[PDB]
């Protein structure tokens, strides 16, 4: 549908802003220079809101995801496959806004982990994983049925 397609084209700006604000807030509590680089756009506000409201629960899982990603050993060659299978298994049960933010958070954690392990210049490739998965696995469609990404601005705590 046309609404699904608009949402899927907005995901890149949402994910890029989410990555920026999430990294900035964790740094203010080693930096990834690829994450430090329009802010008043509705999609930029959405990414920032979702970084803010997930902060407390994301912190509780930091140690688990660090251990699991070390075990997974993602590389340039297997990261598409691992990201897709992980994201597919996440949504097998269903979709709600928390799981959508968990997907964005997984793209953030994956991008950060591979950079810290020496895979440079990869953030754009993770962004494409997130955008393409949401289009092709009905996540953008669910978001369109909520009224688009702007509906996430009305999530609080």
């Amino acid at each position: 549908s046309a609404s699904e397609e608009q949402v899927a084209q907005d995901t890149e700006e949402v994910f890029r802003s989410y990555v920026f604000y999430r990294h900035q807030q964790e740094q203010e509590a080693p930096a990834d220079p690829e994450m430090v680089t329009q802010p008043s756009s509705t999609m930029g506000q959405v990414g920032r809101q979702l970084a803010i409201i997930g902060d407390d629960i994301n912190r509780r899982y930091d140690s688990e995801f660090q251990t699991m990603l070390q075990h997974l050993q993602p590389t340039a060659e297997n990261a598409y496959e691992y990201f897709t299978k992980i994201a597919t298994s996440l949504f097998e049960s269903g979709i709600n806004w928390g799981r959508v933010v968990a997907l964005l958070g997984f793209g953030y954690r994956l991008a950060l982990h591979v950079y810290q392990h020496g895979l440079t210049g990869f953030l754009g490739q993770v962004t494409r994983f997130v955008v393409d998965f949401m289009l092709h696995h009905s996540i953008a469609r669910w978001i369109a049925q909520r009224g688009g990404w702007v509906a996430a601005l009305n999530l609080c705590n």
Partner: peptide, 25 residues
């Protein structure tokens, strides 16, 4: 395969906890 399932399970747990903690603004 075992690591993929563990990671996806944690994402679902974290996402469901986030979803339960959020209301309207």
């Amino acid at each position: 395969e075992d690591i993929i399932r563990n990671i996806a399970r944690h994402l679902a747990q974290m996402g469901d906890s986030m979803d339960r903690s959020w209301g309207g603004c």
